[PDB]
Amino acid sequence: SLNSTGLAQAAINGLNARFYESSNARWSSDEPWWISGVALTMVIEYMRRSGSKEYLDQVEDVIEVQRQPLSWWPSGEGEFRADATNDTGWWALAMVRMYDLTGNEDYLNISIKDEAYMRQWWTDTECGGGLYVDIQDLTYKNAIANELYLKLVASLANRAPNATIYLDRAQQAWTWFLGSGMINGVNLINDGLARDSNTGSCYNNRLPVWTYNQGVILGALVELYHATKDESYLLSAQAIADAVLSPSNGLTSSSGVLTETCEGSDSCNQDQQVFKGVFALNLAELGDAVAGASSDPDAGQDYREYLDTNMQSMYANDRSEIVPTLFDSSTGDLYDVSWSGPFRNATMPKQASAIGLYVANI
Ligand SMILES: OC[C@H]1O[C@H](OC[C@H]2O[C@H](O)[C@@H](O)[C@@H](O)[C@@H]2O)[C@@H](O)[C@@H](O)[C@@H]1O
Ligand SMILES: OC[C@H]1O[C@H](O)[C@@H](O)[C@@H](O)[C@@H]1O
């Protein structure tokens, strides 16, 4: 009885009415810039799966302005090339989805510039591969910057000209990620790697298991499947997704609701508030690829049922509505960080995570 398309549009309206800045062509200048890129990916994804184009003009506005050289990183020379490789990766993947929606080669070209920019900080001399996240310091090869890069080259291997060098880079990047040790004994991905002070060897730093570090890798393995037709990539993604859905690992509550590790202590900062929706959208990409790769009608049913359970829970316990006025006739929905907990406030990262879950059910 739940229309995920209608609720996604209501959440996007709530996101715009409360957090969109027309004068800046950006959501919430007080919140991390990379989350505007995630929010743009959510809006673009809503339009792709629903067939709507209500926000196409707004998206183009954001793209044209945020494409300019960043005031805090002019050496990047615009095209979303920022001071952290993970910032560039989020916008690069948004530009891939923009190309998927419009077919405009201009957006694909941004994604190609972003790939070359990110590879500038891939080094085989530390950890045998992988790239750094802190461009200025080069002290952290974490999980998210390398999952974003892996998903980028894997997508370019399916859409860009000269896609062979991108397929070669994606297969080598996955080989490094697998052998890095960041995937642990229960098939979940820790935050990043640390380096031995004496030997220079790298090891899993045992930092928290974040939901979006279990999601972006699924989209990367799905794009690696499309380019190779090798179901081995899907099986590896399925093992990671299964670990997230298993209540023994703590990411799935006893009610079957996705729960970030910081929700219990109510310590989720601006970054962590958006992590859940990123995983949900990527899990929908896996479930779609799994269902199409087999003739079983029940293929991917566990992932679809999981997304539906979380949608209903957040529908009933995490929802609020903006108060309409005599002057502002705007309508929509607002959401907090916990998909099962109550509503205390609504911020842009929590709103963006909200849209991602609804779009994952479209
Ligand atoms: O919150 C957990 C993550 O925290 C850091 O990533 C977020 C921050 O780092 C990015 O380089 C920049 O975009 C910042 O603006 C952003 O706030 C990393 O430690 C990451 O590995 C963690 O998962
Ligand atoms: O304002 C500074 C600007 O650059 C920083 O590196 C990032 O945190 C951005 O999110 C922020 O908007």
Numbering used by the authors: 78 to 439
What does the paper say about this structure?
Notably, our structural characterization by X-ray crystallography combined with glycan fragment screening indicated that CtGH76 can recognize GPI-anchors like members of the Dfg5 subfamily but shows a broader promiscuity toward other glycans with central α1,6-mannobiose motifs due to the presence of an elongated glycan-binding canyon. Here, we present the crystal structure of a novel fungal GH76 member from the F/B-mixed subfamily, in complexes with different glycans and glycan fragments. Together with structural bioinformatics, we found that members of the F/B-mixed subfamily act as secreted GHs in glycan degradation, which includes not only α1,6-mannans but also GPI-core glycans.
For the active-site mutants D164N and D163N, soaking with α1,6-mannotriose resulted in α1,6-mannobiose binding to subsites −1/−2, alongside with single mannose residues at subsites +3 and −4. When comparing the wild-type of CtGH76 with its aspartate mutants after soaking with α1,6-mannotriose, sugar residues at subsites −4, −2, and +3 adopt nearly identical conformations. Glycan mapping revealed that the putative substrate binding site of wild-type CtGH76 contains only single mannose units for α1,6-mannotriose, whereas DD motif mutants accommodate both mannose and α1,6-mannobiose within the binding canyon.
